[PDB]
Amino acid sequence: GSLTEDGLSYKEKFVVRSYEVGSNKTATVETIANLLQEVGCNHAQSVGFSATTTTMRKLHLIWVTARMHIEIYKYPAWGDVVEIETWCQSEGRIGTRRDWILKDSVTGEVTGRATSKWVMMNQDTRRLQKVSDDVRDEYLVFCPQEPRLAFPEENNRSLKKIPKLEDPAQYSMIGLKPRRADLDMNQHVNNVTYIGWVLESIPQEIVDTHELQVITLDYRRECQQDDVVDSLTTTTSNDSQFLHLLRLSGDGQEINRGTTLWRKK
Amino acid sequence: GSLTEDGLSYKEKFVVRSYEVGSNKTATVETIANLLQEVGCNHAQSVGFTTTTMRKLHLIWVTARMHIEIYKYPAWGDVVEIETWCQSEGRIGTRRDWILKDSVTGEVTGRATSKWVMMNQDTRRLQKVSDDVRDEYLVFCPQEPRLAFPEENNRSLKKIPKLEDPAQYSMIGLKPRRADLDMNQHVNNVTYIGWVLESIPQEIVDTHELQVITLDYRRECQQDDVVDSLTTTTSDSQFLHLLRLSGDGQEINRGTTLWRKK
Numbered sequence: 001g002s003l004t005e006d007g008l009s010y011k012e013k014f015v016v017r018s019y020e021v022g023s024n025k026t027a028t029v030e031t032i033a034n035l036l037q038e039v040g041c042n043h044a045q046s047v048g049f050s051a052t053t054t055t056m057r058k059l060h061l062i063w064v065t066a067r068m069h070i071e072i073y074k075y076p077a078w079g080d081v082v083e084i085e086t087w088c089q090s091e092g093r094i095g096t097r098r099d100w101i102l103k104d105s106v107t108g109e110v111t112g113r114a115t116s117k118w119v120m121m122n123q124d125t126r127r128l129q130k131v132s133d134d135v136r137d138e139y140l141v142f143c144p145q146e147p148r149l150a151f152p153e154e155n156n157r158s159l160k161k162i163p164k165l166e167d168p169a170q171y172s173m174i175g176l177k178p179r180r181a182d183l184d185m186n187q188h189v190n191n192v193t194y195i196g197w198v199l200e201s202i203p204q205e206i207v208d209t210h211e212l213q214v215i216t217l218d219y220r221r222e223c224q225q226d227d228v229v230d231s232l233t234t235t236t237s238n239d240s241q242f243l244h245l246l247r248l249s250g251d252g253q254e255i256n257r258g259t260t261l262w263r264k265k
Numbered sequence: 266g267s268l269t270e271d272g273l274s275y276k277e278k279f280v281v282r283s284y285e286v287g288s289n290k291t292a293t294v295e296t297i298a299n300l301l302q303e304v305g306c307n308h309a310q311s312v313g314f315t316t317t318t319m320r321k322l323h324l325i326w327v328t329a330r331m332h333i334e335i336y337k338y339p340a341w342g343d344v345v346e347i348e349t350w351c352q353s354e355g356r357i358g359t360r361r362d363w364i365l366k367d368s369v370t371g372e373v374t375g376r377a378t379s380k381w382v383m384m385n386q387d388t389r390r391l392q393k394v395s396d397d398v399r400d401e402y403l404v405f406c407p408q409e410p411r412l413a414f415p416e417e418n419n420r421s422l423k424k425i426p427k428l429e430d431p432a433q434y435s436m437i438g439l440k441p442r443r444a445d446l447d448m449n450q451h452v453n454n455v456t457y458i459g460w461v462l463e464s465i466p467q468e469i470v471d472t473h474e475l476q477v478i479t480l481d482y483r484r485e486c487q488q489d490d491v492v493d494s495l496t497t498t499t500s501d502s503q504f505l506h507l508l509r510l511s512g513d514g515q516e517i518n519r520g521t522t523l524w525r526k527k
């Protein structure tokens with residue numbers, strides 16, 4: 001991959017692998033989510049980061065995902081080349097945003113798009129805080145000055161408030177535990193694992209007749225290596241829509257809430 | 266990737282990804298195992314592939330054994346080159362071997378071998394190969410032996426014993442999710458490597474690095490099955506492994522691992 005001519009975004013190409021495809025012979029949404037994270041990491045590395053800045057490392061401050069929103073129009077097939085362009089943008093003191101555009105390499109068409117909201121937090125105490133001026137100035141040189149949105153629409157799905165699922169759930173998947181392949185280099189559960197855990201409670205019939213179009217996910221609390229999760233789903237709706245809740249098996253403490261939209265094959 | 270000049274093997278390069286690395290900032294053995302399978306699939310596709318005779322007779326190739334030896338795990342951002350090739354073992358089945366190299370130095374950083382057997386897709390019955398089907402894949406294999414582990418009496422051909430209860434370590438209630446399934450809805454063979462390593466204690470992960478893993482495949486785990494991973498120390502540190510169904514205790518896999526001090 002490489003930064004574009006103006007140096008304000010990063011582009012990378014990926015060949016879809018055989019173990020990356022699902023039941024439809026096309027890349028899974030988890031595989032796409034991993035590729036979005038991989039291009040994000042290569043963008044951060046290409047501009048000097050390791051995505052903490054000099055001032056963030058001094059204050060023990062990290063960037064944490066608060067929300068992820070993915071919309072796929074066409075999942076790429078095994079052997080296909082997919083091009084992803086990513087860029088960052090400051091949202092004042094609330095935090096930062098990373099947006100992605102997915103394209104089919106041959107036709108040049110937009111086959112998917114994604115947006116994510118990130119917040120600042122102390123690494124040790126887990127306390128969220130507003131972005132300071134010294135931090136904001138350090139990364140503003142790597143972001144486009146005028147707004148560049150992946151979801152520009154006046155009433156886009158990426159900014160909608162997600163409600164809390166009321167018991168009893170229509171569908172559930174109980175006792176989900178992360179293995180070591182679900183952890184990153186710093187031993188934290190990968191943010192992509194929670195997408196998999198959310199989709200564990202979608203019934204087999206929906207998987208058979210429908211294809212996933214949109215997934216919006218709110219991150220409330222992280223799941224530890226020795227924690228156990230319960231994935232809940234209720235139908236809220238041709239198109240099918242769902243409400244999602246991930247919580248700890250014991251106390252019922254919320255770790256994630258979300259929505260999915262499925263279209264008939 | 267591409268077939269080599271003689272067309273009897275296939276080479277492919279991979280850039281190690283950020284989500285592919287573990288606690289040591291280097292690619293996991295599961296990531297390596299996925300890359301071995303990915304280069305195997307690209308080799309099969311580049312030569313026309315199951316053969317034509319196998320398709321009408323409802324026959325498939327199934328993994329019976331996997332043996333991986335890693336000398337140096339590649340770091341995030343490193344380019345790793347894998348060369349793979351097939352070879353007939355007469356009527357017993359086929360063998361696929363791999364060699365892993367560091368792209369910059371050209372050194373061998375790892376090697377793997379796998380034994381495959383013929384099986385009816387519907388009845389799950391072994392039944393040896395035939396002779397008619399060999400005159401279809403012998404043209405894609407080197408004629409003289411080409412072994413990834415050539416040494417007479419090496420680790421890749423050793424008989425694995427059955428773990429006796431009580432196990433020293435265990436991890437119970439392991440279930441596959443949809444990301445653990447392949448396009449045909451069968452549990453990925455790499456998931457069982459992860460399930461085996463779930464019962465290695467945290468202390469071994471902290472002080473040691475995995476060098477060798479030999480795995481026997483006895484039975485497949487279904488989408489609605491639950492697994493228990495057992496481990497006992499047999500000794501460098503060496504371990505004996507057993508994966509079995511949570512209920513009846515039916516064996517699905519047995520294995521060994523060898524760990525080197527960091």
Ligand SMILES: Nc1ccc(F)cc1C(=O)O
Pocket residue numbers: 021022023024028196199200202207443444
């Ligand atoms: N891999 C998956 C994960 C979740 C899901 F709901 C469906 C699939 C699939 O293979 O279509």
Ligand SMILES: Nc1ccc(F)cc1C(=O)O
Pocket residue numbers: 180181286287288289293459462463465470
């Ligand atoms: N990913 C892993 C899976 C099993 C294991 F025993 C260790 C690791 C690691 O990150 O070193």
